[PDB]
């Protein structure tokens, strides 16, 4: 039962290269829940973190992390606390949600994510945003705008070279443009936690932003491939991966932050960026406020 002890499943290239129509998502265990010892989002976020522990994440001093969709209908933010437990002690966490909440973030901003004005570039973007209206399924499942427009612009302007993203999607909450932007990272996948395996939720991961097109992705076809993968892949609900947490914390990599003009970016720089060994962005003081 090897996969039960993994934090979840990552979309394989076997399904990335397929070419199929977008079909309805039909999970055999749909909306089955697993009991927790502890909010379910604790186990969801820890499993995402465990999977990112296997990725070439850049981990600098004073790491800049922004967490969108961090609130719950309970007024608390279990995911942000997991991020606090996972990240280096000197990491800066900014979180945000439409609704009021309280959290262990350094900076907490209320309102539409569009009101979140980031003056600088950040190192890691986590989004768990989901718009309630996506539940009103009528007609074709088409690419969505919503907060994805904001996130896509963020990736293009306010993400360090070398930085990464993890953005929650579902069968109906998804964006053609966001999939295509995954082609500007060194590597990308969709990761589905075992704790929420009965959901079409997945975290779209872009690992090590390169600012240039590395893979030409048809975003509509790729979402159809993601759904084909979910429709083809038994996933058992499980939190076994959280039984041993001795190595849960993000490795303290001391990744360097360099300022470089675009023309100075040679093959060495790209290689370092692609291996998680370098960030390119300002080294100023971060300014993240509501506009």
């Amino acid at each position: 039962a090897s996969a039960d002890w993994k934090p979840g499943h990552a979309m394989p290239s076997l399904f990335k290269v397929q070419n199929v129509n977008l079909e309805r998502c039909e999970l055999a265990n749909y909306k089955q829940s697993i009991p927790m010892p502890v909010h379910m989002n604790i186990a969801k976020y820890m499993q995402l973190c465990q999977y990112l522990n296997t990725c070439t994440l850049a981990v600098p001093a004073n790491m800049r992390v922004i967490h969108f969709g961090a609130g719950s209908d309970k007024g608390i933010a279990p995911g942000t606390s997991v991020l606090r437990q996972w990240l280096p002690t000197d990491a800066i966490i900014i979180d945000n949600d439409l609704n009021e909440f309280v959290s262990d973030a350094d900076i907490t901003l209320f309102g539409d994510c569009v009101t979140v004005r980031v003056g600088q570039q950040v190192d890691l973007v986590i989004s768990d945003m989901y718009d309630p209206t996506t539940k009103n399924v009528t007609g074709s499942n088409e690419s969505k705008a919503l907060f994805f427009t904001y996130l896509c612009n963020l990736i293009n302007n306010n993400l360090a070279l070398g930085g990464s993203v993890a953005i929650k999607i579902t069968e109906h909450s998804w964006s053609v443009e966001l999939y295509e932007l995954m082609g500007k990272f060194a590597w990308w996948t969709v990761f589905c936690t075992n704790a929420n395996a009965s959901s079409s939720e997945g975290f779209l991961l872009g690992i090590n932003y390169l600012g240039t097109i590395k893979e030409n992705i048809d975003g509509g076809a790729m979402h159809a491939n993601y759904i084909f993968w979910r429709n083809s892949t038994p996933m058992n609900l499980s939190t076994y991966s959280l039984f041993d947490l001795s190595k849960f914390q993000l490795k303290l990599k001391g990744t360097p932050v360099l300022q470089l003009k675009e023309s100075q970016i040679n093959e060495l720089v790209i290689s370092l960026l692609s291996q998680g060994k370098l960030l390119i962005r300002d080294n100023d003081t971060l300014s993240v406020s509501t506009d």
């Binding site: 502890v38 909010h39 604790i42 933010a77 262990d104 973030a105």
Partner: protein, 121 residues
């Protein structure tokens, strides 16, 4: 929740108001953010990372602060919350009311373990 949280906005002593409420049968504040931890920590009260022993549970600090949860002024003359952005260890026998426990106790000023639940000074 939305009742005891509402209550501590009708008083000048929110700490006493909460404690009197739960000491008289009131439902403790729920939805404190309990973490999953290797029970291999030092056992101090308040810590940058989780530090639960096998006899403890760790909570996200803001979730166990009455002042954070009720969105009222913190009493610290510094204005800065002692819990928010940090983790707070609770004796495992007290997980029924993490907030009540925090209002009721104080970490040792020299050893930083809970007085009566770890402090050996």
């Amino acid at each position: 929740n939305s009742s005891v949280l509402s209550l501590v906005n009708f008083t000048v002593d929110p700490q006493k108001a909460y404690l009197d409420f739960v000491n008289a049968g009131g439902a403790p504040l729920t939805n404190c953010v309990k973490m999953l931890t290797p029970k291999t920590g030092t056992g101090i009260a308040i810590s940058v990372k989780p530090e639960s022993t096998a006899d403890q549970e760790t909570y996200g600090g803001a979730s166990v602060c009455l002042y954070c949860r009720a969105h009222i002024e913190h009493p610290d003359v510094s204005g800065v919350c002692k819990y928010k952005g940090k983790f707070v260890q609770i004796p495992a026998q007290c997980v029924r009311d993490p907030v009540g426990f925090c209002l009721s106790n104080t970490p040792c000023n020299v050893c930083q373990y809970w007085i009566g639940y770890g402090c050996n000074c």
